[PDB]
Design a protein around this ligand. Structure first.
Ligand SMILES: NC(=O)c1ccc2c(n1)-c1sccc1CCO2
Length: 327
């Protein structure tokens, strides 16, 4: 599409306020200061939006996310607080912005814009004051069954929304589910591993791709086989096990590579706690089928998990409350 050219050149070299579609087109050229901000509350100043000039990170800089790359920040002009994820330009994948720009769902963290500055791509988004589901598991040890189901339910609604639009999330895990301040709303974040799937519907380990979290990789990812939206379902069920047990599946002592065991061993259904209700155990098993064609889709599993939650009397347990011992 060469008539983008003229629009994209107008965007280049500048930070502007604009719409999602413009950000996506600019981001395709990211393989000094430029980008698009999608909300009123972040404003460029004279064609620029520069760290520690127009926006500032919180003063004791601590960092969340796997690489401590996510920070709380404040626009200096407006005072509005939000989150920024820093990504190294040389590793930036176009899909991180092309897949999520223009999505609108309460199960997906809102994108506020992205700005390139030197060797950084700064991705701005809503600051969810409840923190991540990963932080919650760490803080509480492990989650009771009803709360685990509730959050898996919401993640699956997010995945239905993405899969319907031919978007594979690619790193579904507790760390990438963010929570409102009261714990009642969960939403998917981090599209660094996302992939746009073909019309047909249904490769991964080729070209510019960056693999997800290893303990959560489906067998077909690890075997180099063709990959589709079912990869996310496997991955969400490894998250469920993490919620219930307080640790990732496949964690336990062994030397040598874990990717071999995921290929060769049976699925980690033995880690399902014996005290789970039967529909909870059944659902996790249907999401953890080794062959993607035998695995539940997002829609199917979402219905089942909603039923499982009703089967245990609905969401009753406290938001935070009491430490539960893992293992
Ligand atoms: N936006 C927030 O409030 C927020 C808080 C904590 C986070 C994150 N986001 C993100 S964004 C992309 C990845 C991650 C990893 C989890 O750490």
């Amino acid at each position: 599409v060469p008539v983008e050219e003229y629009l994209v050149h107008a965007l280049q070299g500048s930070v502007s306020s604009g719409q999602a579609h413009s950000l996506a087109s600019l981001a395709k050229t990211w393989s000094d200061n430029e980008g698009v901000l999608l909300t009123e509350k972040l404003k460029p100043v004279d064609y620029e939006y520069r760290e520690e000039v127009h926006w500032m990170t919180h003063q004791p800089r601590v960092g969340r996310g796997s690489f401590g790359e996510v920070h709380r920040m404040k626009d200096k002009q407006t005072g509005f607080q939000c989150a920024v994820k820093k990504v190294r330009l040389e590793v930036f994948r176009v899909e991180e912005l092309v897949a999520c720009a223009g999505l609108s769902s309460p199960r997906i963290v809102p994108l506020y814009g992205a700005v390139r500055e030197g060797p950084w791509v700064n991705i701005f988004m809503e600051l969810l004051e409840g923190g991540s589901l990963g932080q919650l598991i760490k803080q509480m040890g492990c989650l009771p069954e009803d709360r685990a189901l509730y959050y898996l339910g919401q993640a699956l609604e997010g995945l239905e929304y993405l899969h319907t639009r031919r978007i594979l999330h690619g790193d579904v895990k507790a760390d990438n589910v963010l929570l409102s301040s009261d714990g009642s709303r969960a939403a998917l974040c981090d599209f660094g591993h996302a992939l746009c799937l073909q019309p047909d519907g249904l490769s991964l380990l080729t070209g510019d791709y960056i693999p997800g979290t290893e303990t959560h990789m489906a067998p077909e990812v690890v075997m180099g086989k063709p990959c589709d939206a079912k990869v996310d379902i496997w991955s969400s069920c490894c998250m469920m096990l993490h919620m219930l047990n307080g640790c990732h599946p496949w964690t336990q002592y062994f030397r040598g590579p874990l990717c071999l065991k995921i290929a060769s061993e049976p699925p980690p259904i033995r880690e399902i706690p014996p005290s789970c209700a039967p529909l909870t155990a059944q659902a996790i098993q249907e999401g953890l089928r080794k062959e993607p064609v035998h695995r539940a889709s997002a829609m199917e599993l979402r219905r089942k998990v909603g039923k499982a939650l009703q089967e245990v009397g609905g969401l009753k347990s406290p938001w935070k409350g009491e430490y539960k011992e893992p293992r």
